[PDB]
Amino acid sequence: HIEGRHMAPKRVVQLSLKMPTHAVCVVGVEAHVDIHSDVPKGANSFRVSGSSGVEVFMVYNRTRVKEPIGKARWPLDTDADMVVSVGTASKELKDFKVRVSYFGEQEDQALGRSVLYLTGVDISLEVDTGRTGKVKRSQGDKKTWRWGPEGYGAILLVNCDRDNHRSAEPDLTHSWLMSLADLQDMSPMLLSCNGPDKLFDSHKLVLNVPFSDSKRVRVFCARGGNSLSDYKQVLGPQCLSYEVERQPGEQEIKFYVEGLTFPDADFLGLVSLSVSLVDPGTLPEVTLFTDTVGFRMAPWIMTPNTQPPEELYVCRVMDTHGSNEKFLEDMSYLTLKANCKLTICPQVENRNDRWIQDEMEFGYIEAPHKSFPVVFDSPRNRGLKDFPYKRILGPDFGYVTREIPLPGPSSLDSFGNLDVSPPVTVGGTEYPLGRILIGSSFPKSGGRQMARAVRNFLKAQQVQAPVELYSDWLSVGHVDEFLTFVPTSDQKGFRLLLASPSACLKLFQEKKEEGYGEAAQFDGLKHQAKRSINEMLADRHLQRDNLHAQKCIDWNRNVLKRELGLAESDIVDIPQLFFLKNFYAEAFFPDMVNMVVLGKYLGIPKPYGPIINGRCCLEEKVQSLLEPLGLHCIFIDDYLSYHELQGEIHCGTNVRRKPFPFKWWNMVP
Ligand SMILES: [Ca+2]
Ligand SMILES: [Ca+2]
Ligand SMILES: [Ca+2]
Ligand SMILES: [Ca+2]
């Protein structure tokens, strides 16, 4: 005795021995007919035959056992029902026939007959279902989505880009079509309406989207034909329904669908669209049939450093009494060996904001095919605020962002704190697109990534599925300081680079073990006080700093090894020394771990360490650690224009990379 339920309408066709009755039916859908409606003259049972292409079944009042009626006389008391099915689309109104004749024993033959005419219709909302090509035909009713190589329901791109140079904003925001090319960013939906036109003049087709999903999708259709001006928006944010304009000869109508919103805390990615069929000659109005399809918003995906470089971004900034042009030339040199485009953001756009790693994260979106990259513009909002929205966003490039309450952003909101791992299979559960890595304060306290918004947005994608690291011990507090990845021919393969104070102290002591002992730091050049190998080691302040730092990096090591399914062969420890200011960790010398990775070419900040027999020993320690993997180590001076400001090469650059060959829809999150 449940209180209340939304329950499906029941259309039951009445019969008359006096007058023939007519009925509408959609192909492949049962038509409930009432044989008990008019029963003649104390008749004992019945016989019903119909034709042609008509099927008649009896269904006991449980959910199961269609039992087809033969030529055999059926008792008039059964568990009550009759169902008729029309196999094709009717060429003319009332061209299917079904006749019922009632019997008795109590003969000769029928004591009366009831006549029922049927009009067959084909109503199917169809989308792209096996992922290829164009829309496909599923009835065959299946689930709206399934996650494997298995097969599922449809995919939809969130449309953000300007294939339009008329407007400053992505086509997402507009209620009318602008470019024709914008249609290439949209998913096809075919509405099959097949039958007599005289039928459609009474019963009407209506196309709906739920209010929940109203603002997440736009649906366009061309009534006119095949010209930019003929496209109207049939469904949108404030339009929940479309009364289909169907001209008599046209039995299949094409629709175009575009996603308004990426998956978020409020949205799990599933959007449902409906084509119903109603009979307006009725109040209450009846809906005779409904077909519902579904879409899945293509998630935002990140590319790890192990991916091949395409375009590197560095901004020309100058001042503190100087210029970074030299660094820019180093970067040109370095980029054009890797064969990748080098984009230099001039000074007038960046307002001397040199960190282009923090402002945005490069990513991509993908459909059966249309695949184009998307920028995630950070809430950071300092000197680069307008760069992604103005400079980047364009015909094939996307824009997405999340704004922030007060008083955000914090430093943890900078996207240098947002990274992602190379593809990794862990404990039987595989992550082909990698795993997102964001820094936070140690669990059980402190400032998080100051956007609960971007966090929500990142875990919502349900793909790479972010793990949280501990960056807060660092003054700037980005994961890119102590962490990175490099590509390798073996094994998985790739290797994770961790900052290792203990390894650095180790190196210095083992070279103190040789004559070698007093070669100093910041040797290469200087206005800044030289210092040694042995009062490193003799000083214990800095080693409190470095043992603490190494401890924190050890914690992050346990987390990373656990979550990414890593073994010590995967990890490589790059020597790095830190120091403490106001309880927070800065870098003692430029941070080598923070570096730009382009293929086997690694742009690295140049530490100035002990000079022993012609070389910086730290540099060559690194070379000995890396080069055997095939990685050529290039050392670039970032010192005055970057390190002085507590940032390094990777942090002063931003790299867009080639999307994964693997297709996100083929994994199982
Ligand atoms: Ca577009
Ligand atoms: Ca911004
Ligand atoms: Ca496009
Ligand atoms: Ca990053």
mmCIF file of N, CA, C and O in Angstrom, residues 16-86:
data_model
loop_
_atom_site.group_PDB
_atom_site.id
_atom_site.type_symbol
_atom_site.label_atom_id
_atom_site.label_comp_id
_atom_site.label_asym_id
_atom_site.label_seq_id
_atom_site.Cartn_x
_atom_site.Cartn_y
_atom_site.Cartn_z
ATOM 1 N N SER A 16 -16.571 -2.609 -30.580
ATOM 2 C CA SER A 16 -18.017 -2.567 -30.736
ATOM 3 C C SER A 16 -18.471 -3.514 -31.839
ATOM 4 O O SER A 16 -17.916 -3.516 -32.937
ATOM 5 N N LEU A 17 -19.480 -4.324 -31.537
ATOM 6 C CA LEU A 17 -20.071 -5.201 -32.537
ATOM 7 C C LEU A 17 -20.966 -4.386 -33.461
ATOM 8 O O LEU A 17 -21.217 -4.770 -34.603
ATOM 9 N N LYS A 18 -21.439 -3.253 -32.951
ATOM 10 C CA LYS A 18 -22.295 -2.354 -33.716
ATOM 11 C C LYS A 18 -21.500 -1.524 -34.720
ATOM 12 O O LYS A 18 -21.907 -1.374 -35.872
ATOM 13 N N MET A 19 -20.369 -0.985 -34.279
ATOM 14 C CA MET A 19 -19.540 -0.140 -35.131
ATOM 15 C C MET A 19 -18.077 -0.567 -35.107
ATOM 16 O O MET A 19 -17.557 -0.951 -34.061
ATOM 17 N N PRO A 20 -17.408 -0.498 -36.265
ATOM 18 C CA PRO A 20 -15.971 -0.784 -36.310
ATOM 19 C C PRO A 20 -15.163 0.334 -35.660
ATOM 20 O O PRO A 20 -15.495 1.508 -35.821
ATOM 21 N N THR A 21 -14.114 -0.032 -34.931
ATOM 22 C CA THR A 21 -13.287 0.951 -34.242
ATOM 23 C C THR A 21 -11.904 1.003 -34.874
ATOM 24 O O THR A 21 -11.426 0.009 -35.414
ATOM 25 N N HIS A 22 -11.263 2.165 -34.813
ATOM 26 C CA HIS A 22 -9.929 2.322 -35.377
ATOM 27 C C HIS A 22 -8.917 2.645 -34.285
ATOM 28 O O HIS A 22 -9.279 3.151 -33.222
ATOM 29 N N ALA A 23 -7.651 2.343 -34.552
ATOM 30 C CA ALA A 23 -6.596 2.563 -33.573
ATOM 31 C C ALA A 23 -5.246 2.847 -34.231
ATOM 32 O O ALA A 23 -4.957 2.379 -35.336
ATOM 33 N N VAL A 24 -4.430 3.627 -33.528
ATOM 34 C CA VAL A 24 -3.060 3.934 -33.924
ATOM 35 C C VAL A 24 -2.099 3.006 -33.205
ATOM 36 O O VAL A 24 -2.292 2.715 -32.027
ATOM 37 N N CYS A 25 -1.070 2.525 -33.893
ATOM 38 C CA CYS A 25 -0.042 1.780 -33.173
ATOM 39 C C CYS A 25 1.346 1.953 -33.772
ATOM 40 O O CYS A 25 1.518 1.948 -34.988
ATOM 41 N N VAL A 26 2.335 2.089 -32.895
ATOM 42 C CA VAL A 26 3.725 2.229 -33.302
ATOM 43 C C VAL A 26 4.340 0.852 -33.520
ATOM 44 O O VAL A 26 4.070 -0.079 -32.761
ATOM 45 N N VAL A 27 5.152 0.727 -34.565
ATOM 46 C CA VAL A 27 5.794 -0.539 -34.911
ATOM 47 C C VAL A 27 6.598 -1.123 -33.751
ATOM 48 O O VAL A 27 7.411 -0.432 -33.135
ATOM 49 N N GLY A 28 6.358 -2.397 -33.456
ATOM 50 C CA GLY A 28 7.109 -3.100 -32.434
ATOM 51 C C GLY A 28 6.608 -2.827 -31.029
ATOM 52 O O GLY A 28 7.230 -3.236 -30.050
ATOM 53 N N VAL A 29 5.481 -2.133 -30.930
ATOM 54 C CA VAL A 29 4.892 -1.830 -29.634
ATOM 55 C C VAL A 29 3.506 -2.449 -29.514
ATOM 56 O O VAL A 29 2.656 -2.261 -30.385
ATOM 57 N N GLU A 30 3.287 -3.191 -28.432
ATOM 58 C CA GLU A 30 2.006 -3.847 -28.195
ATOM 59 C C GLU A 30 0.840 -2.876 -28.179
ATOM 60 O O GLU A 30 0.969 -1.739 -27.727
ATOM 61 N N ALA A 31 -0.301 -3.331 -28.679
ATOM 62 C CA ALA A 31 -1.521 -2.551 -28.572
ATOM 63 C C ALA A 31 -2.561 -3.279 -27.736
ATOM 64 O O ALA A 31 -3.118 -4.285 -28.168
ATOM 65 N N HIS A 32 -2.826 -2.764 -26.540
ATOM 66 C CA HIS A 32 -3.796 -3.398 -25.663
ATOM 67 C C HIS A 32 -5.205 -3.210 -26.207
ATOM 68 O O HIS A 32 -5.660 -2.082 -26.402
ATOM 69 N N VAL A 33 -5.894 -4.319 -26.448
ATOM 70 C CA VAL A 33 -7.282 -4.269 -26.882
ATOM 71 C C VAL A 33 -8.137 -5.028 -25.872
ATOM 72 O O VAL A 33 -7.708 -6.037 -25.306
ATOM 73 N N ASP A 34 -9.341 -4.519 -25.631
ATOM 74 C CA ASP A 34 -10.238 -5.113 -24.650
ATOM 75 C C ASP A 34 -11.302 -5.952 -25.338
ATOM 76 O O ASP A 34 -12.190 -5.424 -26.006
ATOM 77 N N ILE A 35 -11.210 -7.265 -25.165
ATOM 78 C CA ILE A 35 -12.151 -8.181 -25.790
ATOM 79 C C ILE A 35 -13.411 -8.293 -24.934
ATOM 80 O O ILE A 35 -14.438 -8.806 -25.381
ATOM 81 N N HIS A 36 -13.326 -7.789 -23.705
ATOM 82 C CA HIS A 36 -14.451 -7.809 -22.776
ATOM 83 C C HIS A 36 -15.323 -6.563 -22.900
ATOM 84 O O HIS A 36 -16.335 -6.442 -22.210
ATOM 85 N N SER A 37 -14.924 -5.640 -23.773
ATOM 86 C CA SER A 37 -15.612 -4.358 -23.910
ATOM 87 C C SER A 37 -17.079 -4.535 -24.282
ATOM 88 O O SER A 37 -17.969 -4.087 -23.558
ATOM 89 N N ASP A 38 -17.327 -5.194 -25.408
ATOM 90 C CA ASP A 38 -18.688 -5.541 -25.793
ATOM 91 C C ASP A 38 -18.766 -7.028 -26.123
ATOM 92 O O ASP A 38 -18.207 -7.484 -27.122
ATOM 93 N N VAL A 39 -19.470 -7.777 -25.279
ATOM 94 C CA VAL A 39 -19.631 -9.216 -25.465
ATOM 95 C C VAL A 39 -21.085 -9.537 -25.801
ATOM 96 O O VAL A 39 -21.995 -9.223 -25.031
ATOM 97 N N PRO A 40 -21.317 -10.120 -26.982
ATOM 98 C CA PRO A 40 -22.689 -10.348 -27.447
ATOM 99 C C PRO A 40 -23.441 -11.516 -26.812
ATOM 100 O O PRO A 40 -22.866 -12.578 -26.601
ATOM 101 N N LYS A 41 -24.718 -11.296 -26.506
ATOM 102 C CA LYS A 41 -25.707 -12.375 -26.436
ATOM 103 C C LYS A 41 -25.301 -13.644 -25.684
ATOM 104 O O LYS A 41 -25.607 -14.738 -26.131
ATOM 105 N N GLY A 42 -24.639 -13.505 -24.540
ATOM 106 C CA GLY A 42 -24.219 -14.669 -23.768
ATOM 107 C C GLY A 42 -23.293 -15.612 -24.526
ATOM 108 O O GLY A 42 -23.511 -16.824 -24.556
ATOM 109 N N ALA A 43 -22.249 -15.053 -25.132
ATOM 110 C CA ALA A 43 -21.281 -15.839 -25.897
ATOM 111 C C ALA A 43 -20.258 -16.513 -24.981
ATOM 112 O O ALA A 43 -19.773 -15.901 -24.030
ATOM 113 N N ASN A 44 -19.923 -17.767 -25.274
ATOM 114 C CA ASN A 44 -19.045 -18.541 -24.397
ATOM 115 C C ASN A 44 -17.559 -18.217 -24.567
ATOM 116 O O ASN A 44 -16.810 -18.193 -23.591
ATOM 117 N N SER A 45 -17.138 -17.966 -25.803
ATOM 118 C CA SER A 45 -15.725 -17.748 -26.102
ATOM 119 C C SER A 45 -15.554 -16.938 -27.382
ATOM 120 O O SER A 45 -16.525 -16.399 -27.907
ATOM 121 N N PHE A 46 -14.325 -16.835 -27.883
ATOM 122 C CA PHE A 46 -14.108 -16.043 -29.088
ATOM 123 C C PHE A 46 -13.053 -16.580 -30.049
ATOM 124 O O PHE A 46 -12.176 -17.377 -29.693
ATOM 125 N N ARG A 47 -13.173 -16.108 -31.286
ATOM 126 C CA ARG A 47 -12.156 -16.293 -32.296
ATOM 127 C C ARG A 47 -11.769 -15.020 -33.064
ATOM 128 O O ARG A 47 -12.594 -14.395 -33.701
ATOM 129 N N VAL A 48 -10.481 -14.684 -33.036
ATOM 130 C CA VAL A 48 -10.012 -13.478 -33.707
ATOM 131 C C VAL A 48 -8.889 -13.699 -34.723
ATOM 132 O O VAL A 48 -7.807 -14.187 -34.391
ATOM 133 N N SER A 49 -9.146 -13.304 -35.966
ATOM 134 C CA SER A 49 -8.114 -13.364 -36.994
ATOM 135 C C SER A 49 -7.940 -11.997 -37.637
ATOM 136 O O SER A 49 -8.905 -11.252 -37.821
ATOM 137 N N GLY A 50 -6.700 -11.678 -37.984
ATOM 138 C CA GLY A 50 -6.365 -10.379 -38.529
ATOM 139 C C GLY A 50 -5.248 -10.520 -39.538
ATOM 140 O O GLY A 50 -4.590 -11.560 -39.607
ATOM 141 N N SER A 51 -5.019 -9.457 -40.300
ATOM 142 C CA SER A 51 -4.189 -9.524 -41.488
ATOM 143 C C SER A 51 -4.049 -8.142 -42.133
ATOM 144 O O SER A 51 -4.859 -7.239 -41.874
ATOM 145 N N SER A 52 -3.009 -7.966 -42.947
ATOM 146 C CA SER A 52 -1.894 -8.909 -43.019
ATOM 147 C C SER A 52 -0.630 -8.209 -42.546
ATOM 148 O O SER A 52 -0.433 -7.024 -42.810
ATOM 149 N N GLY A 53 0.221 -8.943 -41.839
ATOM 150 C CA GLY A 53 1.371 -8.343 -41.190
ATOM 151 C C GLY A 53 1.010 -8.011 -39.756
ATOM 152 O O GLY A 53 1.838 -7.530 -38.983
ATOM 153 N N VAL A 54 -0.247 -8.271 -39.411
ATOM 154 C CA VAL A 54 -0.732 -8.079 -38.052
ATOM 155 C C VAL A 54 -0.450 -9.317 -37.212
ATOM 156 O O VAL A 54 -0.560 -10.443 -37.694
ATOM 157 N N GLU A 55 -0.077 -9.101 -35.956
ATOM 158 C CA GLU A 55 0.143 -10.195 -35.024
ATOM 159 C C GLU A 55 -0.768 -10.036 -33.815
ATOM 160 O O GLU A 55 -0.954 -8.929 -33.317
ATOM 161 N N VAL A 56 -1.350 -11.135 -33.348
ATOM 162 C CA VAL A 56 -2.215 -11.079 -32.177
ATOM 163 C C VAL A 56 -1.725 -12.032 -31.093
ATOM 164 O O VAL A 56 -1.490 -13.212 -31.350
ATOM 165 N N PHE A 57 -1.572 -11.509 -29.882
ATOM 166 C CA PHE A 57 -1.089 -12.297 -28.757
ATOM 167 C C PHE A 57 -1.986 -12.143 -27.534
ATOM 168 O O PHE A 57 -2.725 -11.159 -27.400
ATOM 169 N N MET A 58 -1.916 -13.133 -26.648
ATOM 170 C CA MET A 58 -2.562 -13.061 -25.345
ATOM 171 C C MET A 58 -1.496 -13.018 -24.259
ATOM 172 O O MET A 58 -0.512 -13.756 -24.312
ATOM 173 N N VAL A 59 -1.694 -12.147 -23.276
ATOM 174 C CA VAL A 59 -0.728 -11.970 -22.201
ATOM 175 C C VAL A 59 -1.398 -12.105 -20.840
ATOM 176 O O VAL A 59 -2.242 -11.293 -20.468
ATOM 177 N N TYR A 60 -1.015 -13.132 -20.093
ATOM 178 C CA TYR A 60 -1.550 -13.321 -18.752
ATOM 179 C C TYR A 60 -1.059 -12.166 -17.890
ATOM 180 O O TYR A 60 -0.041 -11.554 -18.201
ATOM 181 N N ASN A 61 -1.752 -11.882 -16.794
ATOM 182 C CA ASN A 61 -1.633 -10.569 -16.165
ATOM 183 C C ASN A 61 -0.383 -10.417 -15.305
ATOM 184 O O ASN A 61 -0.199 -9.402 -14.632
ATOM 185 N N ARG A 62 0.462 -11.441 -15.321
ATOM 186 C CA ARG A 62 1.846 -11.303 -14.887
ATOM 187 C C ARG A 62 2.619 -10.581 -16.016
ATOM 188 O O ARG A 62 2.037 -10.254 -17.048
ATOM 189 N N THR A 63 3.902 -10.294 -15.816
ATOM 190 C CA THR A 63 4.703 -9.604 -16.827
ATOM 191 C C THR A 63 5.036 -10.455 -18.065
ATOM 192 O O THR A 63 5.402 -9.912 -19.107
ATOM 193 N N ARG A 64 4.919 -11.777 -17.943
ATOM 194 C CA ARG A 64 5.499 -12.707 -18.923
ATOM 195 C C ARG A 64 4.528 -13.412 -19.891
ATOM 196 O O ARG A 64 3.335 -13.111 -19.952
ATOM 197 N N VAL A 65 5.107 -14.343 -20.652
ATOM 198 C CA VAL A 65 4.451 -15.246 -21.617
ATOM 199 C C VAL A 65 3.466 -14.581 -22.606
ATOM 200 O O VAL A 65 2.242 -14.616 -22.459
ATOM 201 N N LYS A 66 4.021 -13.913 -23.608
ATOM 202 C CA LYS A 66 3.252 -13.744 -24.827
ATOM 203 C C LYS A 66 2.872 -15.143 -25.301
ATOM 204 O O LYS A 66 3.749 -15.983 -25.508
ATOM 205 N N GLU A 67 1.581 -15.407 -25.460
ATOM 206 C CA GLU A 67 1.161 -16.631 -26.131
ATOM 207 C C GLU A 67 0.389 -16.262 -27.386
ATOM 208 O O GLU A 67 -0.695 -15.683 -27.305
ATOM 209 N N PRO A 68 0.955 -16.583 -28.556
ATOM 210 C CA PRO A 68 0.315 -16.254 -29.831
ATOM 211 C C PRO A 68 -0.969 -17.034 -30.058
ATOM 212 O O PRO A 68 -1.008 -18.252 -29.848
ATOM 213 N N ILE A 69 -2.005 -16.319 -30.484
ATOM 214 C CA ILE A 69 -3.267 -16.935 -30.851
ATOM 215 C C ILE A 69 -3.123 -17.630 -32.208
ATOM 216 O O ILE A 69 -2.653 -17.046 -33.191
ATOM 217 N N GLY A 70 -3.553 -18.885 -32.236
ATOM 218 C CA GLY A 70 -3.493 -19.741 -33.408
ATOM 219 C C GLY A 70 -4.756 -19.604 -34.223
ATOM 220 O O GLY A 70 -5.215 -18.520 -34.460
ATOM 221 N N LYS A 71 -5.289 -20.672 -34.772
ATOM 222 C CA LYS A 71 -6.647 -20.567 -35.313
ATOM 223 C C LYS A 71 -7.652 -21.122 -34.257
ATOM 224 O O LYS A 71 -8.778 -21.415 -34.595
ATOM 225 N N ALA A 72 -7.193 -21.354 -33.026
ATOM 226 C CA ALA A 72 -7.977 -22.079 -32.060
ATOM 227 C C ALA A 72 -8.929 -21.180 -31.273
ATOM 228 O O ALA A 72 -8.623 -20.018 -31.035
ATOM 229 N N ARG A 73 -10.110 -21.679 -30.910
ATOM 230 C CA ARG A 73 -11.110 -20.871 -30.174
ATOM 231 C C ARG A 73 -10.663 -20.597 -28.734
ATOM 232 O O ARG A 73 -10.412 -21.528 -27.973
ATOM 233 N N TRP A 74 -10.593 -19.319 -28.360
ATOM 234 C CA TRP A 74 -10.086 -18.916 -27.041
ATOM 235 C C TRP A 74 -11.211 -18.609 -26.047
ATOM 236 O O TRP A 74 -12.114 -17.830 -26.355
ATOM 237 N N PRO A 75 -11.151 -19.212 -24.846
ATOM 238 C CA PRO A 75 -12.139 -18.959 -23.789
ATOM 239 C C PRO A 75 -12.247 -17.478 -23.448
ATOM 240 O O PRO A 75 -11.226 -16.797 -23.346
ATOM 241 N N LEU A 76 -13.469 -16.986 -23.272
ATOM 242 C CA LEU A 76 -13.676 -15.557 -23.087
ATOM 243 C C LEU A 76 -13.338 -15.130 -21.658
ATOM 244 O O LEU A 76 -13.183 -13.941 -21.381
ATOM 245 N N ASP A 77 -13.208 -16.091 -20.750
ATOM 246 C CA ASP A 77 -12.629 -15.765 -19.454
ATOM 247 C C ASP A 77 -11.214 -16.323 -19.344
ATOM 248 O O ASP A 77 -10.994 -17.523 -19.184
ATOM 249 N N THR A 78 -10.260 -15.406 -19.428
ATOM 250 C CA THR A 78 -8.850 -15.684 -19.237
ATOM 251 C C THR A 78 -8.410 -14.599 -18.274
ATOM 252 O O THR A 78 -9.244 -13.830 -17.797
ATOM 253 N N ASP A 79 -7.122 -14.519 -17.978
ATOM 254 C CA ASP A 79 -6.620 -13.338 -17.309
ATOM 255 C C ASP A 79 -6.579 -12.245 -18.377
ATOM 256 O O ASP A 79 -5.881 -12.364 -19.386
ATOM 257 N N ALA A 80 -7.335 -11.177 -18.129
ATOM 258 C CA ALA A 80 -7.853 -10.306 -19.189
ATOM 259 C C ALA A 80 -6.808 -9.528 -19.984
ATOM 260 O O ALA A 80 -5.991 -8.805 -19.408
ATOM 261 N N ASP A 81 -6.876 -9.669 -21.310
ATOM 262 C CA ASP A 81 -6.037 -8.922 -22.252
ATOM 263 C C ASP A 81 -6.261 -9.324 -23.708
ATOM 264 O O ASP A 81 -6.839 -10.371 -24.000
ATOM 265 N N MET A 82 -5.801 -8.468 -24.614
ATOM 266 C CA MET A 82 -5.408 -8.874 -25.961
ATOM 267 C C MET A 82 -4.382 -7.861 -26.453
ATOM 268 O O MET A 82 -4.477 -6.681 -26.122
ATOM 269 N N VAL A 83 -3.403 -8.299 -27.239
ATOM 270 C CA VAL A 83 -2.432 -7.346 -27.770
ATOM 271 C C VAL A 83 -2.193 -7.544 -29.262
ATOM 272 O O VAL A 83 -2.001 -8.664 -29.726
ATOM 273 N N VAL A 84 -2.219 -6.450 -30.017
ATOM 274 C CA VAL A 84 -1.955 -6.530 -31.447
ATOM 275 C C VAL A 84 -0.686 -5.760 -31.807
ATOM 276 O O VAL A 84 -0.359 -4.740 -31.197
ATOM 277 N N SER A 85 0.036 -6.280 -32.793
ATOM 278 C CA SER A 85 1.309 -5.715 -33.214
ATOM 279 C C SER A 85 1.346 -5.544 -34.724
ATOM 280 O O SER A 85 0.976 -6.448 -35.473
ATOM 281 N N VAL A 86 1.793 -4.376 -35.168
ATOM 282 C CA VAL A 86 1.921 -4.104 -36.591
ATOM 283 C C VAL A 86 3.396 -4.090 -36.984
ATOM 284 O O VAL A 86 4.201 -3.373 -36.390
#
